[PDB]
Symmetry: D2
Subunit: 235 residues, 4 copies
């Protein structure tokens, strides 16, 4: 089955499957049940920015989410990604809606990956500060589309700008990413994306994710709403 | 047919199809007949480095090739790549052998591409300082292989290290590259690679190329030897 | 005397000292009389962005200035900066006002410099996306201040936000920049800055400059208004 | 007094002041007595590479040191550098010798620093892959010299290539570095350097350091040998 590592911007408390009782950011290691969460004060309709960082020396996967002028939310978890993920992965963003909804709009997305073994590390770096209708270097899955106002729309939003329920969508970068190998000395990656989460009715759902998966990964069956498009069950 | 822009490290004078009468670097715009060439003193069996640069403001495509301690060879040509290439391309290295031969060994390859329209340019950057036997982010065509001594071998070299005749090989980066669009303000790219050209008998052939092509490009039929794997005829 | 290379955003036609009869961008090589100019439609009070690029292979210094949704203005000039500038320089922004005025406000400023001689080039890169009141890595000269709304104010603006006449100001990066040497193979630099030019009365003056100078350079006497803070006379 | 954070490549066991009884890498937080050490198998006369990384989200300062083909040594320590260092610092390398000696030769040194508050982080990046006799962007202190074989020699080495006793030397980058501020959201830095440690007699001393200090820092009196040029006492 897929091997998934993710940072989840979890907008909807699913307390029956281990969510804390408040919107949160979490680190997910091959399970929707986050290994660590921090309370996240989502600001409806504002543009937020997420930064994620890892290196094989410290073996600490960190994420921070912030809005303008507001306090940040940070979460970290000590995990040896070398032992967890395959040597070759694809990187991506995912989002879902359920009975409740939200725009899962991505305004920009940047990613850097380095793999060392003399400074001769191998590196991959990409930055989308703007998305075009034909984004050939993105693999779109599910309901995700590109082009609308130069944005990446992970979940189904009707033409009026209203978000739809029970949507799922993902975008993976086209090239595969080399994140470890047998001989490896140091590896590190770094990811950032700006997002816009708007929900009209009382509360939004279900969230946005930055994730790392085996190269052939696609939306698992049953992965909607609270499973953020990454996992088939809630184990 | 393919749309090809290339910088050729032309090791073998094909004077009957417009080569100058000496090894040369050239800028090729949709023809093997270089728009501009400079004399290039190849040093058999040495490691050389090539740097290529372009931006849409100056509209000048430049290349320099150098060996340690030795004088460099530089060539430039004013060309509006916006008007010449498609908006989406793939980037690559090619090499051939003919009746004469050479190792077309690539030790490293780095590439940067930026596309602007606030500093929010889109960017792609990759660096192979080392090639592994399974290089999933490279599309190998023809006789090109990866892994041997951490190198990219574009043309057929027998296990002993001897180069074979009438070989052709190319490697293109897996992700497509966005190099222009309708709205574009500025675009630029930058490429560098280290290569090792060894030939035992008197003189080598045929050369190495860095090239930019339509995404679906493959080795055209009839493109061996003097056509460096890029062109079907010598027009 | 100082050795100055600059890209000038010349907002005020000084036709008596060789300006064209319209606001323009220009390339200045040790003289205020631009070696090449392009017509520039300044948009009062809008945020514009300038990109400048050079490399020692093509020997073509280019600049582009653009505003949102509007056509760009581009200018290029073939010049061998190796032969023109000293091996060690400082890089900076300058601006002036005269009898007419303008805000010469800098919102961001990024600069990259590379010097090569194996990919072992030397490099300097800095980015100010925000300026703080105590910007210790900037050398402020003349009327330039830092901090106001996170901006760099090159020329005197009164506390109300109104620009003052006969101001001059420059900011140079604190570290010296190594842009060539005897052994050099390739060198290149790249600079970008976002600026805000507002003038209330009919027309603004005098302009903004990105420049490269000998390390000890300061505002020459007599360099105000039309001499943009770079040159003592109009030769 | 100076505020010092450093990663020490400690070649000589000073067990009387808390060193483990073997050469080690350590993380030093305002004391020569390392907060954490790892055993380091130094290879006399080989070229080694050190990588150091920190970010304000994970608050984990990591270092790895490796030689070709050999196992690496890694060390980490959870420390909130925001609370420890001043907002403005200088970054540098230091080295010493004592009764025993070693070449403290630096072949290359690269450093990246980012400070965020939209992707508009402030950044400083420099890379010396080669040092020239007149390195104007380095502040040399003590016995450190630049130019010899394109290398940075931190401690006194006689013209023959033999290392001298009771030497001390440091090099700091010329520009000050902005590593935090009141408004800050995220900060991170990253440093790498290649070094050559050769000692003829039985064992070398005393070590090499990458350090971060208040901008005006200089070699404290009494800081030789085992105090690696950073600290006046061994507290
Ligand atoms: C009733 O719950 C549904 O709606 C919530 C919120 O959208 C989801 O978390 C969940 O998976 C279901 O799809
Ligand atoms: C006889 O010519 C052949 O050999 C030379 C040198 O290899 C090639 O340039 C050419 O295309 C042919 O294949
Ligand atoms: C009368 O001219 C003055 O004003 C213009 C416009 O500001 C400047 O160009 C010039 O140098 C003088 O200072
Ligand atoms: C006797 O000790 C001296 O020599 C060792 C090894 O060089 C140093 O650690 C120490 O500071 C002294 O200078
Ligand atoms: Ca949830
Ligand atoms: Ca030829
Ligand atoms: Ca003028
Ligand atoms: Ca010691
Ligand atoms: Mn959750
Ligand atoms: Mn040719
Ligand atoms: Mn002018
Ligand atoms: Mn120690």
């Amino acid at each position: 089955a897929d091997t998934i590592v993710a940072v989840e911007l979890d907008t909807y408390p699913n307390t029956d499957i281990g969510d804390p009782n408040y919107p949160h950011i979490g680190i997910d290691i091959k399970s929707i049940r986050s290994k660590k969460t921090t309370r996240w004060n989502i600001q409806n309709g504002k543009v937020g920015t997420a930064h994620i960082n890892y290196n094989s020396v410290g073996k600490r996967l960190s994420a921070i989410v912030s809005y303008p002028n507001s306090d940040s939310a940070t979460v970290s978890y000590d995990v040896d990604l070398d032992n967890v993920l395959p040597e070759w992965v694809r990187v991506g963003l995912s989002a879902t809606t359920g009975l409740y909804k939200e725009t899962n709009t991505i305004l920009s997305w940047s990613f850097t990956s380095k793999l060392k073994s003399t400074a001769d590390a191998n590196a991959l770096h990409f930055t989308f500060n703007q998305f075009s209708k034909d984004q050939k270097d993105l693999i779109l899955q599910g309901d995700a589309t590109t082009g609308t106002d130069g944005n990446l729309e992970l979940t189904r939003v009707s033409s009026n700008g209203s978000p739809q329920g029970n949507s799922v969508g993902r975008a993976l970068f086209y090239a595969p990413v080399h994140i470890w190998e047998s001989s490896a000395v140091v590896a590190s990656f770094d990811a950032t994306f700006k997002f816009l989460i708007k929900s009209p009715d009382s509360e939004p759902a279900d969230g946005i994710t930055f994730f790392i998966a085996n190269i052939d990964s696609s939306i698992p069956s049953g992965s909607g709403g609270r499973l953020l498009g990454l996992f088939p069950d809630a184990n």
